[PDB]
Design a protein around this motif. Structure first.
Motif, PDB file in Angstrom:
ATOM      1  N   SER A   1       0.969  -1.353  -0.248  1.00  0.00           N
ATOM      2  CA  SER A   1      -0.061   0.142  -0.011  1.00  0.00           C
ATOM      3  C   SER A   1       0.934   1.050  -0.111  1.00  0.00           C
ATOM      4  O   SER A   1       0.517   2.085  -0.413  1.00  0.00           O
ATOM      5  CB  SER A   1      -0.935   0.217   1.220  1.00  0.00           C
TER       6      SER A   1
ATOM      7  N   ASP B   1       0.554   4.246  -2.642  1.00  0.00           N
ATOM      8  CA  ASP B   1       0.057   5.464  -1.774  1.00  0.00           C
ATOM      9  C   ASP B   1       1.313   6.383  -2.458  1.00  0.00           C
ATOM     10  O   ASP B   1       1.093   7.741  -2.913  1.00  0.00           O
ATOM     11  CB  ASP B   1       0.488   5.666  -0.662  1.00  0.00           C
ATOM     12  N   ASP B   2       2.460   6.401  -2.999  1.00  0.00           N
ATOM     13  CA  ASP B   2       3.302   6.965  -2.960  1.00  0.00           C
ATOM     14  C   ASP B   2       3.884   7.213  -4.985  1.00  0.00           C
ATOM     15  O   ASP B   2       3.900   7.961  -4.983  1.00  0.00           O
ATOM     16  CB  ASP B   2       5.057   6.613  -3.208  1.00  0.00           C
TER      17      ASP B   2
ATOM     18  N   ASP C   1       0.676  10.236  -4.904  1.00  0.00           N
ATOM     19  CA  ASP C   1       0.970  11.331  -3.755  1.00  0.00           C
ATOM     20  C   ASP C   1       2.226  11.983  -3.994  1.00  0.00           C
ATOM     21  O   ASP C   1       2.898  12.913  -4.366  1.00  0.00           O
ATOM     22  CB  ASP C   1       1.316  10.925  -2.475  1.00  0.00           C
TER      23      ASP C   1
ATOM     24  N   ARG D   1      10.932   7.698   0.629  1.00  0.00           N
ATOM     25  CA  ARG D   1       9.960   6.908   1.495  1.00  0.00           C
ATOM     26  C   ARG D   1      11.157   6.628   2.005  1.00  0.00           C
ATOM     27  O   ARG D   1      11.966   6.141   1.781  1.00  0.00           O
ATOM     28  CB  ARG D   1       9.000   5.880   0.663  1.00  0.00           C
TER      29      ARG D   1
ATOM     30  N   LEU E   1      -9.399   0.958   3.749  1.00  0.00           N
ATOM     31  CA  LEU E   1      -8.543   1.409   3.235  1.00  0.00           C
ATOM     32  C   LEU E   1      -8.378   2.077   2.074  1.00  0.00           C
ATOM     33  O   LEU E   1      -8.784   3.036   2.009  1.00  0.00           O
ATOM     34  CB  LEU E   1      -7.173   0.419   3.365  1.00  0.00           C
TER      35      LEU E   1
ATOM     36  N   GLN F   1      -8.846   5.633   0.907  1.00  0.00           N
ATOM     37  CA  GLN F   1      -8.026   6.218   0.354  1.00  0.00           C
ATOM     38  C   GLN F   1      -8.592   7.225  -1.027  1.00  0.00           C
ATOM     39  O   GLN F   1      -7.794   7.950  -0.996  1.00  0.00           O
ATOM     40  CB  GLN F   1      -6.972   5.216  -0.744  1.00  0.00           C
TER      41      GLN F   1
ATOM     42  N   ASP G   1      -9.175  11.074   0.466  1.00  0.00           N
ATOM     43  CA  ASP G   1      -8.107  11.914   0.580  1.00  0.00           C
ATOM     44  C   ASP G   1      -7.865  12.094  -0.689  1.00  0.00           C
ATOM     45  O   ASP G   1      -7.466  13.561  -1.226  1.00  0.00           O
ATOM     46  CB  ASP G   1      -6.303  11.021   0.806  1.00  0.00           C
TER      47      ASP G   1
ATOM     48  N   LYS H   1      -9.439   5.164   5.765  1.00  0.00           N
ATOM     49  CA  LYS H   1      -7.673   4.793   5.527  1.00  0.00           C
ATOM     50  C   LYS H   1      -6.863   4.129   6.441  1.00  0.00           C
ATOM     51  O   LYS H   1      -6.218   3.496   6.101  1.00  0.00           O
ATOM     52  CB  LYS H   1      -7.321   6.452   4.093  1.00  0.00           C
TER      53      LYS H   1
ATOM     54  N   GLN I   1      -2.353   9.110  12.365  1.00  0.00           N
ATOM     55  CA  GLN I   1      -2.459  10.136  11.007  1.00  0.00           C
ATOM     56  C   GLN I   1      -2.673  11.014  11.383  1.00  0.00           C
ATOM     57  O   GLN I   1      -1.886  12.463  10.371  1.00  0.00           O
ATOM     58  CB  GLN I   1      -3.500   9.207  10.751  1.00  0.00           C
TER      59      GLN I   1
ATOM     60  N   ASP J   1       1.480  12.139  11.501  1.00  0.00           N
ATOM     61  CA  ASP J   1       1.735  12.059  10.477  1.00  0.00           C
ATOM     62  C   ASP J   1       1.619  13.177   9.155  1.00  0.00           C
ATOM     63  O   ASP J   1       2.322  14.707   9.455  1.00  0.00           O
ATOM     64  CB  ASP J   1       0.953  10.767   9.927  1.00  0.00           C
TER      65      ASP J   1
ATOM     66  N   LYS K   1      -1.860  17.763  -0.744  1.00  0.00           N
ATOM     67  CA  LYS K   1      -3.120  17.202   0.268  1.00  0.00           C
ATOM     68  C   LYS K   1      -4.054  17.969   1.721  1.00  0.00           C
ATOM     69  O   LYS K   1      -3.290  19.287   2.163  1.00  0.00           O
ATOM     70  CB  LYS K   1      -2.138  16.453   1.272  1.00  0.00           C
TER      71      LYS K   1
END
Ligand code: IPE
Ligand code: IPE
Ligand code: IPE
Ligand code: IPE
Ligand code: MG
Ligand code: MG
Ligand code: MG
Ligand code: MG
Lengths: 288, 301
Positions: free
Chosen positions: A67, A71-72, A75, A80, A134, A138, A141, A165, A198, A201, A221
């Motif tokens: 994931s 996600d990367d 985004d 990472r 999830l 996602q 978002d 998410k 979250q 983060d 974001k």
């Protein structure tokens, strides 16, 4: 016919797959693997035998890393865990296909946990339910961000997105363990714990920048502080600021001073950083 | 409010559901030959699943197939699918990937709606799991050869193994779920594997023949004709033509004339187009020279 034979052999057998093939397509995954404790701890209660615990562990690891690989890409992330993201090295095509492959490898491992049909079915539902959750999280978002300002989320919508998410994998892990354990649920607790994780983060992406990449800003974001800032400005009639926050998000800029301007607006103009730091404290309090 | 949030399942409105579904609804509104769906109804003549299970199998297959195409178009930098702009160019690569993946898991969810019987249930999940693993293996090889070219030039045999995984995957998933649910008392898997192979070589053939937008050239894909041309030029020490095939595939060109040049080389120098047309006829001969099913393939010749 010499051909007929080979075709005949080809179609009457399971598809051919070698260990070399497995290696060549696992590259994106082995790379992020280059960059748990919670499970060991949570077990003190669940009391799962070791080899079973190790399987749960391999499963969440596959799902967690896979994931992140996706996600990367979603985004547009360059880094990472301190290193270049896999998709920039191996390309988006390989990375997506490998991450997806590992979700199914993970699914395969569930059957190694049991054979007791009642139990197995429940383990599979858990796996399937939280993976669905999830993706729902996602999806919002991403939608809010890529279609801004079509939709300006409220704090409540953000919390629900996060429940989906981030809550997904925390709940998947706990739920696999509870169901495997000989024996109230810890789901509400794990939920609050993921919401916290979250928001932190989100907070730390900006605060570590304000003190010394603030990449979430380049991503555009709708983080917890941004959501507070956008609703605060709309609610206080700060039209110019509301729009400037929207404009900087939409630039998808890597300019450090522009990112810093936004962070200072959140700092002094909307007070979103303080609000977010406080919010985190209060949630952590609900456990203390 | 926190308490109520963490003591309930995560919220999901039908409105959210609708937001996430757009990339998928987008591809769903552009039909196809419904080939797999039709094949299903036919084969049920002999499998006899009850109509409700047949509906669920069809839906699982429809979700897998359309989502797999959404993702394949991202992997292949495709500007068009079924004569319409690809979903990732409209809703972006990010939403499109997430939604395709979301649908894989909604297809998985439908598997438990097939049966209560826990013994049968275990096998259906296994079937679903195994062919999705196979689909990703074939797709990973197709992508690897293309993106690492010229590191590995696949042989005809390697190509066929890649296709058994990649295209044979959903064909086998369909048949196996049905043979497993059949109340009816050999297997059609070998037949469905040959169909899959014919189906893929024909796709590769048609993408170049209807031109001769030949997007496969722009993609740099190791398609059947191309695999034939490279292994051929290679075998007959035709260094220069081999290299040229490689240079054009590596350009990722959208140039009508350059695309035309490569097609010309396969048509007039290696004679790969006719080699492929004849290869397809022979695979069809194996079947037709061995019943609704008998027509279907001939249709593919
Ligand atoms: C565990 C999953 C799938 C959530 C990742 O989302 P984010 O994009 O918010 O996470 P980071 O990139 O900040 O790690
Ligand atoms: C679960 C979310 C929100 C993204 C990943 O967070 P982590 O910070 O736990 O990711 P890694 O430590 O594994 O890099
Ligand atoms: C060759 C494969 C497997 C991808 C295209 O399949 P189809 O050509 O059957 O796609 P649609 O008819 O549904 O558009
Ligand atoms: C979509 C899957 C899983 C296999 C087909 O991929 P291809 O790239 O070869 O199919 P087309 O784009 O030609 O339809
Ligand atoms: Mg991210
Ligand atoms: Mg993200
Ligand atoms: Mg393609
Ligand atoms: Mg492809």
């Amino acid at each position: 016919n010499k051909m007929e034979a080979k075709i005949d052999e080809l179609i009457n057998n399971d598809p051919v797959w070698s260990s070399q093939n497995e290696s060549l397509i696992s590259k994106p995954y082995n790379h992020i693997l280059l960059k748990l404790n919670l499970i060991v701890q949570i077990n003190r209660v669940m009391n799962l035998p070791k080899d079973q615990l190790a399987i749960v562990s391999q499963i969440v690891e596959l799902l967690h890393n896979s994931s992140l690989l996706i996600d990367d890409i979603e985004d547009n992330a360059p880094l990472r865990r301190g290193q270049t993201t896999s998709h920039l090295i191996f390309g988006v095509p390989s990375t997506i296909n490998t991450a997806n492959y590992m979700y199914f490898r993970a699914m395969q491992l569930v059957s190694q946990l049991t054979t007791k049909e009642p139990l197995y079915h429940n383990l599979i539902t858990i796996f399937n339910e939280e993976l669905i959750n999830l993706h729902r999280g996602q999806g919002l978002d991403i939608y809010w961000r890529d279609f801004l300002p079509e939709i300006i989320p409220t704090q409540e919508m953000y919390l629900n997105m996060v429940m989906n998410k981030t809550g997904g994998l925390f709940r998947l892990t706990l739920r696999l363990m509870e169901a495997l354990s000989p024996s109230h649920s810890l789901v509400p607790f794990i939920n609050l714990l993921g919401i916290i994780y979250q928001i932190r983060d989100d907070y730390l992406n900006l605060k570590d920048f304000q003190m010394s990449f603030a990449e979430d800003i380049t991503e555009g974001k709708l983080s917890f502080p941004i959501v507070h800032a956008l609703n605060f400005t709309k609610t206080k009639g700060q039209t110019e600021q509301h729009n400037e926050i929207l404009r900087i998000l939409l630039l998808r800029t890597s300019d450090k001073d522009i990112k810093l301007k936004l962070i200072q607006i959140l700092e002094f103009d909307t007070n979103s950083l303080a609000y977010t730091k406080n919010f985190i404290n209060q949630l952590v309090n609900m456990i203390k």
